[model samples]
Target: GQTADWKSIGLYILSFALPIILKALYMLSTRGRQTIKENKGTRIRFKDDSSYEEVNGIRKPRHLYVSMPTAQSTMKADEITPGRFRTIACGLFPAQVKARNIISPVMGVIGFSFFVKDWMERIDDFLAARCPFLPEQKDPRDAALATNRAYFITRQLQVDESKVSDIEDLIADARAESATIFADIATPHSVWVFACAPDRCPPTALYVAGMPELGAFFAILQDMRNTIMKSAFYQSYLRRTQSMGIQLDQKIIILYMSHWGREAVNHFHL
Candidate 1:
């Protein structure tokens, strides 16, 4: 009997072609298009409730821009790193990503429960430290405690992380991408943070994108009481608390622009 000698051939082909074959198969399976209409809609909704008292509010007119560093990709398809999770498909994995996505909607429902509890506590502590007359309230039992309103807008761009030369390059690319929308306004409050862990609140900086026209801007402030404000559901709760003597003032806006795994080079222009 002659030796089959097919073992070496089989091993060689398997060693050389397995990864490519697997990747091709994966791509084929994952390439199907997903339509927004087909997907169940989970959107945030706001309504007006006329149960609360009207309170003082503050407005910070700003054009905000933010960016984050990108990670480097490699030819090794099988290797999965923490950075890989940041990709659209990978980021939603292992529960944390999904949880983060749901946070906004949930916060819309509960109206910043933790902020009412924890943030209020911090404020109470600060007030106590500064003024002995300031009294602390118990845990916020009502959503009305978080009555202050803030407006925020966010956007993100996608690029191949592997293409970025370094972290600075990623930041530069993000800034360049954001510049298109920001060019009209010179200043922006850029809030940024690195995605090192599942849960990390990052720091942000403010840049004046544009200065308000002084006379008209001050005129707007003076006519605030007559300003036809679009009332939201929370606004009613805010008023209720105001009537209750909770003494709420000033609105807070926290804008977040996340760029975890990818750079903005592909989707934006400088």
Candidate 2:
């Protein structure tokens, strides 16, 4: 006895009501992706008909630690390029987190968002500090890229400024139709790489001295930067590195055991 009127009602309900109902039901079903899965990592999907993949394993929180040099004094943006910021951020990891994890067996989430907020501030303050285009002219995009590049150096712990420059240059070079570059790199595999290194541990290690609730800070920033680094243009920057020469390679050094700190920790090694 279904009439046109009823058909319309049914379509409306199914198309609109059904989706809302389904979403509500789904939301009610699980407390977290971790709840029902039991050790079966979380799966995420990117496209329709595409297979979902596991993104996270069982959760076990551990004590996190980290350490770093907060500018003896604030510096300018042009004076401290985004690349140098990254280099300094990367160098702090070994002494702050890596060495500790090597000595003790621990499991926990290491975060990296600090690099984002701090580096972003540095970039913004640098721009504002240098360029007076505030209410008049604001290139959020340029500021964002500088923040990203600086943030990436902190998370990757071992990236070349040349690589960052190559990325920016390549994108600028490709300004044909889209002289601008936009990148986003997110995948289950990408998350795994992030979880594996100085990104997760080093920053946390630095936190042992109680650097403030950085909020899995390092991880957050890594995720943010990864969003940009995994893009077509960003990848192009990495690709173009073949033709570039290394600059400022030996200009930076991360002091692990400051002459005195190392002397204190190395009594056993020597």
lDDT of each: 0.21, 0.24
lDDT of 2 at 156: 39
List, residue by residue over 24-96, the lDDT tens digit for candidate 2.
2222222222323332322211121222223486333321111122232443222321222222222222222
Model 1 Cα shift for residue 1 (angstroms): 56
lDDT of 1 by residue, 1-270 (tens): 011111222222123222232232222223212221232333111112311222456332221111111233232332322222112121112122222322222122222223223333433332223222223336655422322110111111111221222322323343422311121111111110111121111101111111111111112222332242232333432342233222222212111011110221122211
Model 1 misplacement above 4 A? 1-103, 110-165, 179-270
Per-prediction tally of clashes: 9, 21
Instruction: State the displacement of the C-alpha of residue 8, model 1, in Å, after optimal TM-score superposition.
Output: 39
Error of 2 at 39 (Å): 17
